[PDB]
Design a protein around this ligand. Structure first.
Ligand code: HEC
Ligand code: HEC
Ligand code: HEC
Ligand code: CL
Ligand code: CL
Ligand code: CL
Ligand code: CL
Ligand code: CL
Ligand code: CL
Ligand code: CL
Ligand code: CU
Lengths: 106, 106, 106
């Protein structure tokens, strides 16, 4: 999928997790977010289109999705551990990783 | 290792998982698959040899092994949770990720 | 952070794990190591500064941190499963991955 579609999937599933009742719902949404994060790794964001495809900026962009996927996975572990409120709280904390990349490249 | 050798390790361990008796056999095979997937990330596949090393095609190739590694890890989690036949079925479902990359680059 | 700073974080937390009393101490250190491993993925190491940014050597370098992150995560799983001394021993075994990269690129 294109970058913007993956970002809509990330944003939409944050709100799903926010309103989730149980851990299965949280787990399903985090799974969808992890897939979107890795798929977004394939894209070139408009503000880096003039950069080398392996410039430091593009590497930082791509590695940002590795960091987000690993952080999504930490939240999933908390859900799989039955700790739903903790997984939700962790899913909210993902915004700091969302924001860090946006501040540089959105 | 060679790309071809990593693919043999992926294929061989998919059949090991299919015939496995118990969770330890599944987890050991999935561990070997994850290692092969990440090692295959280092390679340039013959059909992309005339492409730039960070062309969209090479990124898509490399990210495909991130996606496979994460999907392998999901199956390992199910095995770690004792859900053996669920892990085996998940390992069978990896073939859709195997085929998606093959369709494009094999 | 600097590549050098990330390497000191990996080294320091290996000794923290070696002396840890319980699983929360091991988990917290492994989390810091995984973060440093992925951040180190963004760097260009001195020995490869004259290589193209997606040369086979730079890919091998970056994928080495994917492999380390996954091995760190395997050790965390062992901690999260209460197997403290098994996680400590696994953290000690990470040195073979530290050494393999160092031999090529340090
Ligand atoms: C870099 C590593 C990013 C991470 C991590 C996240 N986002 Fe992002 N996002 C990024 C870019 C470069 C862009 C611009 C894309 C474009 O083509 O304009 C975006 C955009 C969004 C959007 C708006 C999409 C649009 O219509 O243009 C949203 C709603 C969004 N991002 C949400 C989002 C969330 C919730 C994230 C973490 C959970 C997140 N993004 C991570 C780069 C990166
Ligand atoms: C891209 C991201 C791939 C993924 C994911 C998987 N495979 Fe693959 N495979 C890929 C290529 C480009 C090639 C051709 C390599 C060559 O040098 O010809 C292959 C090849 C195979 C083979 C045959 C190996 C050979 O002797 O040439 C097998 C048996 C194979 N692949 C199996 C396999 C399985 C089971 C996968 C999922 C678990 C899988 N591959 C993923 C690229 C990619
Ligand atoms: C490549 C994939 C590496 C892996 C995996 C690890 N290290 Fe590393 N390290 C690497 C390079 C190219 C360098 C030299 C660059 C530099 O930072 O100087 C290093 C360096 C170190 C150092 C010295 C830091 C300094 O002040 O120069 C230490 C103490 C170190 N590395 C530790 C370390 C540990 C414990 C690792 C595994 C857990 C590890 N490194 C992995 C490249 C790579
Ligand atoms: Cl996950
Ligand atoms: Cl936007
Ligand atoms: Cl790259
Ligand atoms: Cl990568
Ligand atoms: Cl795994
Ligand atoms: Cl083939
Ligand atoms: Cl971890
Ligand atoms: Cu895990």
């Amino acid at each position: 999928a294109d970058l913007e579609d993956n970002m809509e999937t990330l944003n939409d599933n944050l709100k799903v997790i926010e309103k989730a009742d149980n851990a299965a719902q949280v787990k399903d949404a985090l799974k969808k977010m992890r897939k979107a994060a890795l798929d977004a790794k394939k894209a070139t964001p408009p503000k880096l289109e003039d950069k080398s495809p392996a410039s430091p900026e593009m590497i930082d962009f791509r590695v940002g999705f590795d960091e987000l996927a690993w952080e999504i996975h930490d939240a999933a572990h908390l859900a799989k551990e039955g700790k739903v409120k903790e997984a939700q709280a962790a899913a909210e904390q993902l915004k700091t990783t969302c924001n860090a990349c946006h501040q540089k490249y959105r």
